Amino acid sequence: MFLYNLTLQRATGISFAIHGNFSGTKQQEIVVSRGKILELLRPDPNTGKVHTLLTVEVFGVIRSLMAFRLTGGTKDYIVVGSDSGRIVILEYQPSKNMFEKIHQETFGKSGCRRIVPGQFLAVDPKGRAVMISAIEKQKLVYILNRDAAARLTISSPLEAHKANTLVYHVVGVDVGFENPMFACLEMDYEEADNDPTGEAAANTQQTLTFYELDLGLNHVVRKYSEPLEEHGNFLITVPGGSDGPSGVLICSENYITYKNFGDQPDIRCPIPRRRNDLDDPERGMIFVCSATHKTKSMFFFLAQTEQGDIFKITLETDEDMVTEIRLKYFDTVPVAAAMCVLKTGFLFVASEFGNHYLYQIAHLGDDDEEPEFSSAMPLTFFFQPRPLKNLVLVDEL
Amino acid sequence: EQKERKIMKLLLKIKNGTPPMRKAALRQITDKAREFGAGPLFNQILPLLMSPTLEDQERHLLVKVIDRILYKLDDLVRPYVHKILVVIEPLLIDEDYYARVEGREIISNLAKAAGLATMISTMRPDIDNMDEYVRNTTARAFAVVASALGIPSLLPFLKAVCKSKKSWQARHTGIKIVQQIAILMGCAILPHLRSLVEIIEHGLVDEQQKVRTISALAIAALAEAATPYGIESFDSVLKPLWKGIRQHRGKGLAAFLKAIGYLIPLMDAEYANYYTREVMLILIREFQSPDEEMKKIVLKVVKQCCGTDGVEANYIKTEILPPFFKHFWQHRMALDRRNYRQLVDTTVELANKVGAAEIISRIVDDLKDEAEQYRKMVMETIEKIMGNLGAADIDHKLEEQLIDGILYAFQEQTTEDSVMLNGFGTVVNALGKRVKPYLPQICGTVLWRLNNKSAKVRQQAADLISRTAVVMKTCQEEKLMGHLGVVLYEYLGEEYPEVLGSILGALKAIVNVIGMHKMTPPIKDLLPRLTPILKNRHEKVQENCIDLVGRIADRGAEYVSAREWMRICFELLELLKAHKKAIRRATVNTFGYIAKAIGPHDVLATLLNNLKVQERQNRVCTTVAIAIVAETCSPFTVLPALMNEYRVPELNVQNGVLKSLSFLFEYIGEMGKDYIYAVTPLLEDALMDRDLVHRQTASAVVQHMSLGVYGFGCEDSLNHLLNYVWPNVFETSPHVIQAVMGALEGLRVAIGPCRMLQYCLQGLFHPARKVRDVYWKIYNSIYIGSQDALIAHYPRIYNDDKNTYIRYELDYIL
Amino acid sequence: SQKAEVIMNYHVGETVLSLQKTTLIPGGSESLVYTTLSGGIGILVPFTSHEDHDFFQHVEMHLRSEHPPLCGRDHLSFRSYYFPVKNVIDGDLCEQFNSMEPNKQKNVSEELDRTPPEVSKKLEDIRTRYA
Amino acid sequence: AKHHPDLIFCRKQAGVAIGRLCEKCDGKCVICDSYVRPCTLVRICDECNYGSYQGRCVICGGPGVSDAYYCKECTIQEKDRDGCPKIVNLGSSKTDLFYERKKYG
Amino acid sequence: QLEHLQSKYIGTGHADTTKWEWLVNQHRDSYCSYMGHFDLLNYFAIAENESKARVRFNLMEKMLQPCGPPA
RNA sequence: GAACAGAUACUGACACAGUCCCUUU
RNA sequence: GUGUAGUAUCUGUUC
Ligand SMILES: [Zn+2]
Ligand SMILES: [Zn+2]
Ligand SMILES: [Zn+2]
């Protein structure tokens, strides 16, 4: 009456995808996280047939996966936040062909809990600190200082626990060698339960606050408080310092907002709509994912909507100020939950359901014939979709 | 009136009589504190407390009852805060650790009960007092109250006081308060460094020397509090300190040097190197200072400077060694204790930094001094260096010189200290196999000192043998080991207890290192001499002999007859009375080994006949011995011999067998799944409401068994026990309540939270109160752990017309 | 009333929407194949002899504490997520034997008094028989 | 630990320091006070390890000569996933014993 | 006196806990569990012809005031 | 079953000689 | 042999 468990096929559903030089060389590789299986795969420009390299089962539920590199190194380190109460930092050895544990710190009970961190992972772009936040009331900050032995070390976690608060999305903000800054969609609900008149959900908006990380005094305290007028869902990182101005984007319903700390006023831009949609006119439109091709010449942001339309956001900004946000129509792809653009024109799209395709950029779409859109044009936007012209299908999974 | 008379009779009952009446009075005052009041109580307590005829016991009882009644009066101790503190402060001002710390939490609790305004109105008048003693104790009290209820509510007052110009007394009081806060909080004031930096910055330029000296010492205190980081906040303090360095001379100069030495290790390497280079001149000029306190300060500064990885090793080696070795090796300062404690620590740090070879070569030449204090000091320095760094940088000549110096120092010894023993052991262990040629000489000296002079250092020689047994084993010799063993054999008849314990420990080390079969004196002859030793009444000899007996039983259970086995068993039956926990643990272990060696019939019966002693201390030890016997033997060969014992009507035997079953289940682990059927009738009998002890023991048994069988799917047998475990929750005894809670927690991981959730759901909303409280406590206990695996087991509750209590997302159908 | 009883419990971590007990390869044995919404397909194989069962149980018990998961998740607690595992042996942990370090493989083979080739053959016999 | 209801743990976020145990607390579990199957290591918060508190026993505060571990029962019960087990209370029994020794010598 | 474990946690009940707060805490925990799991959200995505982002948005702005207004 | 006062037992692998972990104008 | 908490069982007087 005793059974034995066996497996025939492996899970193919893709939830996360992070690009980087995990082997330390100049060939980009893709790390894909399944429901409970961690897989590593790389493409080949000569042939285009993607071959799996590593596949190890984690025996757990993975909720986040990010990669980072030290300020000076050439290796990308994988940080995985799972349902457990600990954070693990991974490394890849091409010779051993196996993931090696490096550091391990525990900060609470295991399992998917409301106040246990592990959902949102925030990593500074330069790679000097990592922030892990929970759904409610719990936030943690780590400082990944390196020692003289050409290795990395982890310090004690910091305290940033705000009482009775909800978190929507956390992403790092480039500062340019000063104290790192983190931005999150802060929200309060204490007054919601204190109103027995049924007037809690209405006129209760969310805020956006910046968290500072002072390396001198080693503490985290709230600095800013910028209430919004819409209900955003997730943020977009923007390169700062030398290449472009530091800031974040605010994806919302039929609107995108650029925000910055200092003397930068808020700027809004309507979302373009397809010609004669076959949907409910009152239905809203949101964004699902984005991309960042941080080329040394210039940087452009990709986007995707519910219908599966790729845009191209270009930041037309001055040295200190910003003039307007220019949008563009790029192509149309099946709905995806996570996508990443690669070098040499390679584009990887991980569809939510069905098959996964790998497109190659043949035409850069530099000032296409179709008119563009910008925030400088007063008053909705319409555009006529066209078949796939900029991208050509070469391989499918 | 009556209340005052009540207080008087209560305090006479507390101070005089047996402890039980004191405990009864404490219980009465705790249960009735809600109506005693504060006015008359304190007006009767304080005059007696302040009297100088107060002893330690009466003071402790008074402060304990005061602490017990602090929480009983939340906001009824405010009018007499000044009268409380004027008496409390002299208690803490004494240089006693316990008294000062206890007064510390007393004042902390008093301030927590009070508020900022109350303490302000209480403690303004004494700010500008003139006496230094009351000023110091008031500053300490201010530090405690500022620690209480947070510093930020107190920082603006410190700023206001220190930003005045009336008199220097207020400024000194404020700076002293900041000093005490910094020295007591530690690293808890890191995010509030500026609140004190801007307070203390202005005081470094005043013409008065006292204020700037205290400001410099405060800066040093803040620097040592924020040792890792804080350079950015302290960057604007360097200039006044440097001007004081090149301006002042004396006590203020010492304070400024201490501050700069504490501040150096808080920054990078280049700046630290430059500042050390700048301060080299002052260090050289003050190396020849006459004052011993100045010597301590300069030694601390040198150690702090050398403790940073920013100065080149070669420059330090070529600069600081000659003058430091010329000046800091004397005897006049070595007479005072703290001076050469600090000197030893500084020399150890310097040796760790620059290296061991040069410093050891320079220092070993001083082993020829006649002074015994100098000899022990240099030996302590050498042993500390050897323990810290190692023995990987010593050549042949230094080895020979060190061995000769150690031998000469050992030739003449008079002080009764084990530091020589520790140093010799550490040095020999560090040497390893390089000490082979000098083994015969040192052993001859050891025996020569062993066999003369009333056998006073025989304990020291035995300690030497125990320490050097491992190195002598690694040196590949057996003849000298045999000589040492036989010598200890005839020298085993010493009457002295400490000497007997030491030689027994030496023999234990010998038998540990050398083979039991190859040991030159036969074991069959050692045991007859060893058995009468067990009857001595000294802790050291008993522990040593029991450990040796356990080792020889574990490793030498082949040449021993049953007669002396029974003899030593009977001896241990009464030896189990030993008060030390280690001796009892060793006795239980050796019972385990002897029961493994011999058939578990006679020893098991002997253990079972020792359950009638009417003493609680040894019954649990016998229970643990029985459990370890059953664990080391076959588990199913002891159960028939223990099940039949329960029918004895005496409660002590039943409690003992239940505890033995609990311990056996705990020790077995995952192999106890087969032995659950036999214990079910005993648990069925035990869970009946006969006595609290039986129920508690049964709950412990259930918890241990459930934890052991976790992960094997034995829910079928464990489910039946819950029906009888559950009704044991309605009791007022803390012990049984804790046992039941632990049993439920242990069963939760093994049966699943669904059963306990179903049990708790019925009584969760009972109209009564106590049942609701206990059900809510159980629900909280099950909710804290494994909260994720609860959404599926949650029931469905129908909603009203107003609110919605139905989760339609789980009703989706595909 | 006549309440039923549970004889097996397991947690795959993925939603299962199909169950069927048939034979995959011709001339095989009745196996319990299942599919999940994630996309993975697995089978359940009953044991034949008690010696194989105890050998596999010992191997799994040793590997649970000798080969911890990469993300530091308690494998026993993860499998016993909602209900304790009953009469089920995880095959993934046993199959992870091949990719282990040679030193640990030698140590576990010495502990089990078996050779690594024998362990690999014993592990692959089930896969060859039921696939 | 459990035998004294007047002792309260620090119960704060753990850091990177390692707890230490003295000679008489060698093989005792920190929480449940057991002697079987040490499995994991004990972590203590930063403020409990500073200055004079470096290298001290978690229970009695003696010199540190042995490490602090957790038994298998605590790991299974997941009671190790909590704050540092350092005892901040001074202990009434120790003070009473010290005062009694002082009075009778 | 040993009750500090149950005082430093969110959602812990007490003696005078009524039905509304318990039910709203249960709903919040259920929504958090829905968000955490991947296949439990894929089931919802397949059941109704929307995307993952829309379901996540609905869950995010459904956690504020569930089970109706308070009383 | 609320109390002002006495006596006898049981439970917590509870503890028992610590000399020092010390500290400014 | 001593001390540190808790619990249980038998008594003087009074509701
Ligand atoms: Zn702590
Ligand atoms: Zn200890
Ligand atoms: Zn334990």
SS3 for chain A, per residue? CCEEEEECCCCCCCCEEEEECCCCCCCCEEEEECCCEEEEEECCCCCCCCEEEEEEECCCCEEEEEEECCCCCCCCEEEEEECCCEEEEEEEECCCCEEEEEEEEECCCCCCCCCCCCCEEEECCCCCEEEEECCECCEEEEECCECCCCCECCCCCCCCCCCCEEEEEEEEECCCCCCCEEEEEEEECCCCCCCCCCCCCCCCCCEEEEEECECCCCECCECCCEECCCCCCCEEEECCCCCCCCEEEEECCCEEEEECCCCCCCEEEECCEECCCCCCCCCCCCEEEEEEEECCCCEEEEEEECCCEEEEEEEEECCCCEEEEEECEEEECCCEEEEEECCCCEEEEEECCCCCEEEEECCCCCCCCCCCEECCCCCCCEECCCCCCCEEEEEEC
Cβ of B24 near strand F (under 7 Å)? The reply is: yes
Conformation bin of residue B584: beta by default, left when phi > 0, alpha when psi is -120 to 50: alpha
d(CA A296, CA A302): 17
* CA-derived radius of gyration, chain A: 22
Half-sphere exposure for B173 (CA within 13 Å, toward CB): 29
d(CA E33, CA A116): 12
d(CA B665, CA B92): 51
Measured distance between the N- and C-terminal CA atoms of chain A, rounded to whole angstroms: 40
3 state DSSP class of B265: helix
Per-residue DSSP letter, C9: B
Number of domains making up chain D: 1
d(CA A81, CA A254): 32
User: CB within 5 A of ion ligand 2: which residues?
Assistant: D 22, 25, 57, 59-60, 62
Query: H-helix or E-strand containing B168?
Result: helix B168-185
CA A54 to chain centre: 24
Q: Determined by which method?
A: cryo-EM
Residue closest to F15 C1′ by Cα: D93
Q: How many other CB atoms are found less than 10 A from the CB of residue A179?
A: 12
d(CA B791, CA B763): 20
d(CA B600, CA D92): 44
Write the CB contacts of B266 (distance below 8 Å, at least 6 apart in sequence). Answer: B223, B226, B227, B228, B229, B230, B231, B234
How would DSSP label each residue in C15-83?
-EEEEEEE-SSTT---EEEEEESSS-EEEEEE---HHHHHHHHHHHHHHHHHS--TT---HHHHHTSSS
Q: CA geometry: angle at C58 spanning C54 and C61, to 5°? A: 135
Residue closest to F17 C1′ by Cα: D101
Write the CB contacts of C43 (distance below 8 Å, at least 6 apart in sequence). Answer: A6, A7, A8, C24, C31, C32, C33, C34, C130, C131
Q: Which two tokens stand for residue B677?
A: 């059927």
Half-sphere exposure for E28 (CA within 13 Å, toward CB): 21
Task: Point out which residues pair with A171 in neighbouring strands.
Answer: A183
CA neighbor of B444 nearest in space, from B411, B491, B400, B492? B411
d(CA C107, CA C113): 10
- Count of CB pairs separated by less than 8 Å, B with C: 23
d(CA B777, CA C114): 52
Query: By the CB < 8 Å criterion, does D11 face chain E?
Result: yes
Query: H-helix or E-strand containing B278?
Result: helix B269-287
Task: Point out which residues pair with C35 in neighbouring strands.
Answer: C18, C41
Residue with tokens 């923007």, as numbered in its chain: A238
d(CA B286, CA B257): 10
CA B407 to chain centre: 37
**Nearest ligand to the C-alpha of residue D23?**
2
Return contacts of A305-312, CB within 8 angstroms, 24+ apart. A305/A271, A306/A335, A306/E51, A306/E53, A306/E54, A307/A274, A307/A332, A308/A332, A308/A333, A308/A334, A308/A335, A308/A336, A309/A274, A309/A385, A311/A272, A312/A365
Distance between B737 CA and the closest CA of chain C, angstroms: 27
Query: Domain of D52?
Result: 8-88
Q: Cβ(B339)–Cβ(B333) under 8 Å?
A: yes
Residue closest to F6 C1′ by Cα: B21
d(CA A119, CA A115): 10
d(CA D99, CA B408): 45
Residue D2 lies in a domain: no
3-class SS shares of chain B: helix, strand, coil, % to 5:
70, 0, 30
Q: Which two tokens stand for residue A23?
A: 């082997």
Pairing state between β A207-212 and A86-93: unpaired
CA neighbor of A219 nearest in space, from A157, A171, A167? A157
Q: Which amino acid is at B340?
A: Y
How would DSSP label each residue in E4-17?
GGGTSSTT---TT-
3 state DSSP class of E69: coil
CA neighbor of B158 nearest in space, from B176, B183, B136, B184? B176
Closest-CA residue of A relative to B234 is A216
- Neighbouring chains of B at 3+ CB pairs under 8 Å are A, C, D, E
Separation in Å, CA E58 to CA A119, A287, A336, E53: 18, 14, 18, 9
Q: Which amino acid is at B767?
A: P
- Count of CB pairs separated by less than 8 Å, A with E: 74
Write the CB contacts of D40 (distance below 8 Å, at least 6 apart in sequence). Answer: D69, D70, D75, D80
Residues of A with CB under 8 A from a CB of D: 85, 106-110, 154-157, 159
Half-sphere exposure for A335 (CA within 13 Å, toward CB): 15
Cβ of D99 near strand F (under 7 Å)? The reply is: no
* Backbone phi and psi for residue B151, each to the nearest 5 degrees, phi listed first: -80, -35
Q: Which amino acid is at B159?
A: K
Residue D52 lies in a domain: yes
Q: How many other CB atoms are found less than 10 A from the CB of residue B17?
A: 12
Between chains, do D11 and E4 touch, taking CB under 8 Å as contact? yes
* CA-derived radius of gyration, chain C: 16
Q: Which two tokens stand for residue B447?
A: 């025996």
Q: If 0-12 CB within 10 Å is exposed, 13-18 middle and 19+ buried, where does residue B528 land? A: exposed
Q: CA geometry: angle at B704 spanning B699 and B709, to 5°? A: 125
* Backbone phi and psi for residue B344, each to the nearest 5 degrees, phi listed first: -65, -45
- B404-420 burial, b if ≥16 CB within 10 A, otherwise e? ebbeebbeeeeeeeeeb
Residue D93 lies in a domain: no
Task: Point out which residues pair with A104 in neighbouring strands.
Answer: A88
Q: What angle do helix axes B238-245 and B209-225 make, rounded to 10 degrees?
A: 130
d(CA D17, CA A129): 20
Pairing state between β A346-351 and A139-143: unpaired
Per-residue DSSP letter, D20: E
How would DSSP label each residue in E37-67?
-SHHHHHHHHHTT--HHHHHHHHHTTSSS-S
Q: How many other CB atoms are found less than 10 A from the CB of residue A265?
A: 9
Sign, Cα dihedral of C17, C20, C23, C29: positive
Residue with tokens 């006015």, as numbered in its chain: B39
Q: Which two tokens stand for residue B743?
A: 């049993």
Write the CB contacts of B750 (distance below 8 Å, at least 6 apart in sequence). Answer: B706, B707, B709, B710, B711, B714, B715, B718, C84
Q: If 0-12 CB within 10 Å is exposed, 13-18 middle and 19+ buried, where does residue B239 land? A: exposed
Resolution of the coordinates, Å: 3.8
Cβ of B693 near strand F (under 7 Å)? The reply is: yes
Q: Which amino acid is at A228?
A: L
Residue with tokens 């995985």, as numbered in its chain: A80
CA neighbor of B204 nearest in space, from B241, B170, B155? B241
Residue D95 lies in a domain: no
Q: Which two tokens stand for residue B182?
A: 């910094």
Separation in Å, CA A218 to CA A117, A155, A176, A213, B225: 21, 11, 19, 7, 14
Per-residue DSSP letter, D44: E
3 state DSSP class of D63: strand
**For chain G, which bases have at least one atom within 7 A of a protein Cβ?**
1-8
Q: Cβ(A319)–Cβ(A368) under 8 Å?
A: no
Conformation bin of residue B493: beta by default, left when phi > 0, alpha when psi is -120 to 50: alpha
Residue D54 lies in a domain: yes
Strand order across the A37-42 sheet: A16-20, A29-33, A37-42, A51-57
Residue with tokens 């772009």, as numbered in its chain: A125
Between chains, do B780 and E6 touch, taking CB under 8 Å as contact? yes
Which nucleotide's C1' sits nearest to the alpha carbon of B64? G4
d(CA D28, CA D32): 8
* Backbone phi and psi for residue B66, each to the nearest 5 degrees, phi listed first: -65, -45
Q: What is the domain partition of chain E in residue ranges?
A: 6-70
Query: H-helix or E-strand containing D38?
Result: strand D38-41
Which nucleotide's C1' sits nearest to the alpha carbon of D27? F13
Task: Point out which residues pair with A187 in neighbouring strands.
Answer: A166
3-class SS shares of chain D: helix, strand, coil, % to 5:
25, 20, 60
Distance, Å, A298 CA → F21 C1': 62
Q: Which amino acid is at B717?
A: S
d(CA D83, CA E1): 18
Residue D74 lies in a domain: yes
Task: Point out which residues pair with A382 in neighbouring strands.
Answer: A273
Which nucleotide's C1' sits nearest to the alpha carbon of B26? G5
Separation in Å, CA B305 to CA B262, B302, C114: 9, 5, 60
Residue D94 lies in a domain: no
Pairing state between β A273-274 and A382-383: parallel
Q: Which two tokens stand for residue B48?
A: 């007696």
Separation in Å, CA A242 to CA A85, A239, A261, A297: 38, 9, 17, 12
Task: Point out which residues pair with A227 in neighbouring strands.
Answer: A207
Q: Which two tokens stand for residue B389?
A: 């760094």
Query: H-helix or E-strand containing B552?
Result: helix B539-555
> Ligand 1 mean position to D44 CA, how many Å?
6
Pairing state between β A247-251 and A255-259: antiparallel
Q: If 0-12 CB within 10 Å is exposed, 13-18 middle and 19+ buried, where does residue A191 land? A: exposed
d(CA B53, CA B620): 45
CA neighbor of A106 nearest in space, from D80, B501, D86? D80
Cβ of B213 near strand F (under 7 Å)? The reply is: yes
Task: Point out which residues pair with A314 in neighbouring strands.
Answer: A326
Measured distance between the N- and C-terminal CA atoms of chain E, rounded to whole angstroms: 33
d(CA B606, CA A123): 68
